[PDB]
Structure 1
Amino acid sequence: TGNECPELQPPVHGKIEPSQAKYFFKDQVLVSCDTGYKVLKDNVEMDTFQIECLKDGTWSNKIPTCKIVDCRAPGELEHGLITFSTRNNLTTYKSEIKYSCQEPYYKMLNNNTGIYTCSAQGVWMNKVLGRSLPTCLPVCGLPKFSRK
């Protein structure tokens, strides 16, 4: 009906709607990313990014790329230590950390899973507690010395 526009090359880890055989003048599409990824247009991470096709048959903007969700650094635990599930210290999407509790004077509450994985909402999470950190408790009645 108008002028035709180059078939779009989808982003890595990201959809495009609406998917069409051909694209024409006045048409407009939305670039999305998988669960756990946002769209990066230098230098900001948004949920969708939009482009139209112009009278001259070209796209209004180049296709952006999907940068992974990164929940930064796990919060410190008093009388506790953090250990990672990878040597490179991954903090990106779906990566796990185990909150250990310093021995032998402290133990963890409810002896919970103690594992924290990254939610796609960019947040370190535990399916028992949530965003709330574990609690490390004093160890009662266990003297290091016995009598002669």
Structure 2
Amino acid sequence: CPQPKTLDEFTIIQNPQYQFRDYFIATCKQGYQLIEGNQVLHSFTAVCQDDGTWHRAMPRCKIKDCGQPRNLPNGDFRYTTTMGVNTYKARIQYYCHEPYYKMQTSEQGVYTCTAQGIWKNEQKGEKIPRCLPVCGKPVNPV
């Protein structure tokens, strides 16, 4: 059967001459997603046919969007990379309302888009920080 090709550089080919009954596996880099149209997959398996034509479409391999940050109670965040990007190796930081709130606990509020597809902190995992109410200290006590 006719050999396939790599659309982008984001597709390593596993397993020179492909006959009948043969195949080839398709996995993608270290932290990218594989998609063949609009259906999220993980393990691509292209088999050939009789007339020497590959049946399925060789899928593209785009980058894993880590979605929107799980809404934080009393606190926003700033994008420590480019504003509005949720692709690989993006890095963000939640901040509590200062000074009306404060964060529960050494930067360990720093989350980043890992290769899995969910926001993971370097310590606290996916679990976001927590903002508690700061007692006393009125904006104008005396």
Alignment of 1:7 onto 2:27 = no
Q: Deviations over 1:90-126 (max 9, x none)?
A: 1122211110111111121126421111122211111
1 CA distance for matches of 2:120 and 2:98?
A: 24
The alignment partner of 1:37 has SS state of: coil
1:87: how far off?
Answer: 4.1
Gaps of 5+ in 1: none
| Alignment check: 8 A CA contact 2:108 2:124 kept | no
Amino acid at match of 2:19: F
1:109-120 alignment to 2 at 5 Å? 109-110=104-105, 112-120=107-115
Q: How does 1:76-87 map to 2 (within 5 A)?
A: 76-87=71-82
* Distance in 1 (alpha carbons) for counterparts of 2:141 and 2:33: 59
* 2:115 aligned with 1:124: no
Larger-Rg structure: 1
Q: Percent identity?
A: 40
Match among 10, 13, 18 for residue 16 of structure 1 = 13
Cα distance in 2, alignment partners of residues 95 and 87 from structure 1:
8
Q: CA RMSD, aligned part only?
A: 1.9
Aligned to 2:6, what secondary structure does the other structure show? Answer: coil
Alignment of 1:83-98 (within 5 A): 83-98=78-93
Give structure 1 regions of 4+ aligned residues with deviation exceeding 6 angstroms.
Answer: none
Structure 2 counterpart of 1:61: 56
Partner letter of residue 50 of structure 2? K
Deviations along 1:33-89, one digit per CA (max 9) or x if unpaired, are: 122222211211101211122232222233111122112110111221121134440
Tell me the secondary structure at the aligned position of residue 61 of structure 2.
strand
Confirm or deny that 1:137 pairs with 2:132.
yes
The answer to whether 1:71 aligns with 2:71 is: no
Aligned length: 141
TM-score under structure 2 length normalisation: 0.86
Of residues 17, 40, 43, the one that matches 2:38 is: 43
Q: State whether residues 88 and 113 of structure 2, in contact with CA within 8 Å, keep that contact through their aligned partners in structure 1.
A: yes
